[PDB]
Amino acid sequence: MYAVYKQAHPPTGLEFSMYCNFFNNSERNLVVAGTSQLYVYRLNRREKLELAASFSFFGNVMSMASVQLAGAKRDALLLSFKDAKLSVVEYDPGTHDLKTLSLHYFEEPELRDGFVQNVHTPRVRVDPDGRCAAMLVYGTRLVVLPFSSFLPSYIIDVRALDEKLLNIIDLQFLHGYYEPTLLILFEPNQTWPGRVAVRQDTCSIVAISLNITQKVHPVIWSLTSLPFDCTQALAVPKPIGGVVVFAVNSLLYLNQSVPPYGVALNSLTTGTTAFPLRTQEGVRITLDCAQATFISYDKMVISLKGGEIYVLTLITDGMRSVRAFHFDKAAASVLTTSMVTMEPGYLFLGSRLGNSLLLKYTEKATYSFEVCDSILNIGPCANAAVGEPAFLSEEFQNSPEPDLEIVVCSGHGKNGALSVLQKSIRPQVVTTFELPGCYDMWTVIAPRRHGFLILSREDSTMILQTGQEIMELDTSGFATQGPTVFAGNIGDNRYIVQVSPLGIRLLEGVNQLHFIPVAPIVQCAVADPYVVIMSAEGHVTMFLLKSDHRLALHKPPLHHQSKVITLCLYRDLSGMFTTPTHWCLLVRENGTMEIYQLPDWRLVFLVKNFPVGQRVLVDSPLVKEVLLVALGSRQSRPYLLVHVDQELLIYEAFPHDGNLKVRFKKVPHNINFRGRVARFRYFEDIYGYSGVFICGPSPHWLLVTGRGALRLHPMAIDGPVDSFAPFHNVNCPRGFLYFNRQGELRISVLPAYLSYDAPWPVRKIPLRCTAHYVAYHVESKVYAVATSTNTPCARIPRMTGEEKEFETIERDERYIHPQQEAFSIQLISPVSWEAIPNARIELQEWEHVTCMKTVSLRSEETVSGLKGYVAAGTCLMQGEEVTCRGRILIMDVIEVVPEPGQPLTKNKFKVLYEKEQKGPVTALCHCNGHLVSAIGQKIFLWSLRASELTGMAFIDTQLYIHQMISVKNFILAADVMKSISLLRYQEESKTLSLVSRDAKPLEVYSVDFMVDNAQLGFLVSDRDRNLMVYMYLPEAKESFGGMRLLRRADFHVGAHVNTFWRTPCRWENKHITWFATLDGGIGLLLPMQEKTYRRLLMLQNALTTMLPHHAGLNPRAFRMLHVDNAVRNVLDGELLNRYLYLSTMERSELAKKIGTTPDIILDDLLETDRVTAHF
Partner 1 sequence: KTIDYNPSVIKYLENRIWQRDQRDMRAIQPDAGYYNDLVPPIGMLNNPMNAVTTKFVRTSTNKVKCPVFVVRWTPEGRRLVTGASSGEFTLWNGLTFNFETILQAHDSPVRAMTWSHNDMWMLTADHGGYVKYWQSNMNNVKMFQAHKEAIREASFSPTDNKFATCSDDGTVRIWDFLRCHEERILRGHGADVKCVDWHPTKGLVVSGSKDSQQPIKFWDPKTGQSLATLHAHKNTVMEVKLNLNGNWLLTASRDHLCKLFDIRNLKEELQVFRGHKKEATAVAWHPVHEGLFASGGSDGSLLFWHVGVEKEVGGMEMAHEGMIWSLAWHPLGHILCSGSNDHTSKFWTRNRPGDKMRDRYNL
Assess 68 for contact with partner 1 (CB under 8 A). Answer: no
Footprint of partner 1 on 2-41 (CB under 8 A): 15
Extract the runs of DSSP E, i.e. beta strands, from 374-484.
Answer: 384-387, 405-410, 417-421, 428-432, 438-445, 450-457, 461-465, 471-472
Q: Does 1042 bind partner 1 (CB under 8 A)?
A: no
- Give the nearest distance from C-beta 850 to partner 1 in angstroms: 6
Element (H, E) at 971: strand 971-975
Which residue number, 85 or 1056, has a Cβ lying nearer to partner 1?
A: 1056
Q: Which is nearer to partner 1, 533 or 871 (CB)?
A: 871
Q: Smallest gap, in angstroms, from Cβ of residue 379 to partner 1?
A: 8
Amino acid letter for position 868: G
225 versus 820: smaller Cβ distance to partner 1: 820
- x/- mask, partner 1, residues 128-167, rule CB under 8 A, reads -------------------------------x----x-x-
- Would you say the C-alpha torsion 46, 52, 56, 62 has a positive or negative sign? negative
* Binding residue (CB under 8 A) for partner 1 from 962, 1025, 1047, 1147: 962
Q: Does residue 175 belong to the site contacting partner 1 (CB under 8 A)? A: no
Choose one: 236-244, 537-545, 699-707, 958-966; the region binding partner 1 (CB under 8 A). 958-966
| DSSP helix, strand, coil percent of the chain (3-state; round to 5) | 5, 40, 55
Member of 344, 818, 900, 1155 binding partner 1 (CB under 8 A): 818
Find out whether 563 and 589 touch, Cβ atoms under 8 Å: yes
977 binds partner 1 per the rule CB under 8 A: yes
Q: Which of residues 273-312 bind partner 1 (CB under 8 A)?
A: 286, 288-289, 305
Q: Could you say which residues in the range 823-842 bind partner 1, by CB under 8 A? A: none
Q: Specify the length of the chain in residues.
A: 1175
Closest CA to 747 of 426, 396, 444, 429: 429
Contact 1158, 1146 (CB under 8 A): no
Q: How far apart are CA 1093 and CA 1158, in angstroms?
A: 16
- SS3 label, residue 751: coil
CB of 956 to partner 1, least distance (A): 7
Q: b/e per residue, 706-735, with b = 16+ CB within 10 A? A: bbbbbbbbbbbbbeebbbbbbbbbeebebb
The residue type found at 91 is Y
195 interacts with partner 1 by CB under 8 A: yes
Residue with Cβ nearer partner 1 (413 or 1133): 413
Q: Is the Cβ of residue 379 or residue 1087 nearer to partner 1 in the bound state?
A: 379
Query: Cβ closer to partner 1: 570 or 1060?
Result: 1060
Nearer to partner 1, 168 or 944 (CB): 168
CB 801 to partner 1: min, Å: 8
Q: CA 424 from chain center: how many Å?
A: 17
Distance CA 125, CA 938 (A): 51
Query: Total binding residues for partner 1 by CB under 8 A?
Result: 82
- In degrees and rounded to multiples of 5, residue 938 shows phi and psi of -125, 145
Cβ nearer to partner 1, comparing 431 with 883: 883
SS3 assignment, position 1087: strand
C-beta of 1051: minimal distance to partner 1 in Å? 21
412 interacts with partner 1 by CB under 8 A: yes
Report the C-alpha gap between 60 and 1123 in whole angstroms.
12
Q: Is 125 in the site for partner 1 (CB under 8 A)?
A: no
> Is residue 1122 close enough to count as binding partner 1 by CB under 8 A?
no
Exactly one of 24, 190, 731, 838 binds partner 1 (CB under 8 A); that residue is 190
Are 586 and 602 contacting, i.e. CB atoms less than 8 angstroms apart?
no
**414 DSSP assignment:** G
Positive or negative torsion for Cα 601, 607, 613, 614: negative
Residues 214-243 that bind partner 1 (CB under 8 A): 229, 231
Min separation Cβ 1014 and partner 1, Å: 28
The three-class DSSP label of residue 341 is strand
Q: Is 884 in the site for partner 1 (CB under 8 A)?
A: yes
Among 25, 94, 115, 599, binds partner 1 (CB under 8 A): 115
Nearest to 1072 by CA among 1135, 1128, 1017: 1017
DSSP β-ladder status, 1130-1132 and 3-5? parallel
Of 21 and 996, nearer to partner 1 (C-beta) is 996
Decide: 626 and 643 in contact? Cβ < 8 Å.
yes
From candidates 850, 907, 979, 1172, binder to partner 1 by CB under 8 A: 850
Whether the CB-CB separation of 75 and 733 falls below 8 Å is answered with no
**Under rule CB under 8 A, residue 353 binds partner 1:** yes
Distance CA 36, CA 58 (A): 6
Binding to partner 1 by residue 646, rule CB under 8 A?
A: no
Residues contacting 1094, CB < 8 A, separation 6+ = none
Q: Mark the segment that binds partner 1 (CB under 8 A) among 71-79, 186-194, 430-438, 725-733.
A: 186-194
Choose one: 679-687, 743-751, 870-878, 1144-1152; the region binding partner 1 (CB under 8 A).
Answer: 870-878
CB nearer partner 1, residue 380 or residue 387: 380
Q: By C-beta, is 439 or 960 nearer to partner 1? A: 960
> Quick check: 90 binds partner 1 (CB under 8 A)?
no
Q: Which of residues 426-455 bind partner 1 (CB under 8 A)?
A: none
CB 605 within 8 A of CB 595: yes
Contact 644, 589 (CB under 8 A): no
Q: How far is residue 662's CA from residue 665's CA, in Å, rounded to a whole number?
A: 10
Stretch that binds partner 1, among 1-9, 648-656, 704-712, 792-800 (CB under 8 A): 792-800
Identify residues after which the chain is interrupted (C–N over 2.5 A): 45, 147, 364, 447, 518, 548, 579, 620, 657, 674, 1066, 1124
Contacting residue, 206, 277, 382, 406, with partner 1 by CB under 8 A: 382
Report the distance separating Cα 949 and Cα 914, nearest Å: 10
1058 touches partner 1 (CB under 8 A) = yes
List the beta bridge partners of residue 586: 567, 594
Cβ-based nearer residue to partner 1, 443 or 1006: 1006
Q: How far is the CB of 89 from partner 1 (least distance, A)?
A: 23
Pick from 878, 1073, 1129, 1168 the residue near partner 1 by CB under 8 A.
878
Q: Which of 372, 340, 341, 378 is nearest to 359 (CA)?
A: 372
* Rounded Cα distance, 592 and 713, in Å: 31
Taking the C-alpha atoms of residue 782 and residue 274, their distance in angstroms, rounded to an integer, is: 57
Q: Is residue 997 a contact point for partner 1 (CB under 8 A)?
A: yes
Interface positions, 709-738, toward partner 1 (CB under 8 A): none
**Which stretch in 185-193, 250-258, 548-556, 670-678 sits in contact with partner 1 by CB under 8 A?**
185-193
Cα–Cα distance between 238 and 229 in angstroms, integer? 27
- Binding status of residue 186 toward partner 1 by CB under 8 A: no
Cα 858 to Cα 879: distance, rounded to the nearest angstrom: 37
The site map against partner 1 for 1073-1102 (x = CB under 8 A) is: -----x------------------------
Considering the complex, state which of residue 125 and residue 624 has its C-beta at the smaller distance from partner 1: 125
Segment 246 to 275, residues that bind partner 1, using CB under 8 A: 248-249, 268, 271-272
Stretch in the footprint of partner 1 (CB under 8 A) among 96-104, 645-653, 680-688, 956-964: 956-964
CB of 169 to partner 1, least distance (A): 9
Judged by CB, which is closer to partner 1: 215, or 918?
A: 918
Q: Which of 472, 916, 1003, 1159 binds partner 1 (CB under 8 A)?
A: 1003
